[PDB]
Amino acid sequence: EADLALGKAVFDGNCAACHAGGGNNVIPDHTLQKAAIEQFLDGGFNIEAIVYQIENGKGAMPAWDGRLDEDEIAGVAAYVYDQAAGNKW
Numbered sequence: 770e771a772d773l774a775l776g777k778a779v780f781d782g783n784c785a786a787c788h789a790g791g792g793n794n795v796i797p798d799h800t801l802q803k804a805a806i807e808q809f810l811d812g813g814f815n816i817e818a819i820v821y822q823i824e825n826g827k828g829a830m831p832a833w834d835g836r837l838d839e840d841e842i843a844g845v846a847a848y849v850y851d852q853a854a855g856n857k858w
């Protein structure tokens with residue numbers, strides 16, 4: 770329902786180019802750690818804010834709407850959430 774295995778596959782295939790290990794190769798302080806998200810992700814540490822930025826992109830981050838389907842976006846958003854919330858990177 771969440772689907773973290775799906776989300777990890779989507780992450781490794783599309784997001785790890787810039788965020789492997791939970792970092793950010795382009796803007797190094799805008800990482801995928803909880804405290805970074807809470808400060809820098811417009812909308813805060815919430816699934817809808819993660820979704821929104823996946824869909825629509827921001828700056829140097831490309832938009833994924835139409836290139837990833839609804840289940841793929843939901844699952845990668847849930848994987849980022851889970852990795853941040855559990856301190857798993």
Ligand code: HEM
Pocket residue numbers: 780783784785786787788793795796798799800801802805806809810811819822823827828829830831833845846849
């Ligand atoms: C892959 C679909 C993907 C995901 C998932 C993802 C997530 C993500 C989040 C949650 C943030 C917020 C982090 C914060 O601390 O504010 C974030 C931010 C940026 N991303 Fe990203 N991102 C995905 C893919 C990619 C790719 C492929 C790139 C590199 C070309 C990339 C880059 C960036 C950048 C830059 C930011 C910061 C944007 C800003 O605040 O200006 N992301 N990402």
